[PDB]
Amino acid sequence: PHYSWFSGITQFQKGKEFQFAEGQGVPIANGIPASEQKGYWYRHNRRSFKTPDGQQKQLLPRWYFYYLGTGPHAGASYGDSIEGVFWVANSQADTNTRSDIVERDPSSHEAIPTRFAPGTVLPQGFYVEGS
């Protein structure tokens, strides 16, 4: 239902907290200025796969990025406390105002690989889908 502009981040190690240092964590993309680098990572939790027989196979969480004012919690203000939401912003962004970046329309744009500014420390126990 909610299309992220970017590939997800999958947890592969239990017990590691999803987080970035303040100022870090917004995917970088051509065409998007630093002033629009504000948003949240949203946890797709309780994930499962139904095997051909009937093992309900549990999967670990995957997190997706949404620009501020878009996505599942498009109505939340930056910093609002919600389980499964982690807020991130570049220092040049005004987190008091919604993103000017429109929600992805899958019929017109595909998501792009998640990349970060060089020097961004990723949370341990997580890997970025699509490299």
Residue 104 annotated as binding site:
yes
Range of the domain at 129: 1-131
Residue 43 annotated as binding site:
no
**Contact between 18 and 10 (Cβ < 8 Å):** no
**Domain tally, the chain:** 1
Alpha helix locations (H) across 7-110?
none
Beta-strand ranges (E) seen in 1-131 are 9-11, 38-44, 48-50, 56-58, 62-67, 85-89, 126-128
Q: Long-range pairs for 71-75 at CB < 8 Å and ≥24 separation? A: 71/2, 71/4, 71/39, 71/40, 71/42, 71/103, 72/2, 72/42, 73/40, 73/42, 74/103
**Contact between 42 and 73 (Cβ < 8 Å):** yes
Distance CA 105, CA 23 (A): 28
Distance CA 117, CA 23 (A): 11
Nearest to 65 by CA among 95, 37, 96, 23: 37
Experimental technique of record: X-ray
Residue 98 annotated as binding site:
no
**Contact between 112 and 7 (Cβ < 8 Å):** yes
Q: What are φ and ψ of residue 84, in 5° steps?
A: 85, 15
Distances (CA, A) of 72 to 3, 22, 69, 86, 89: 9, 22, 9, 13, 18
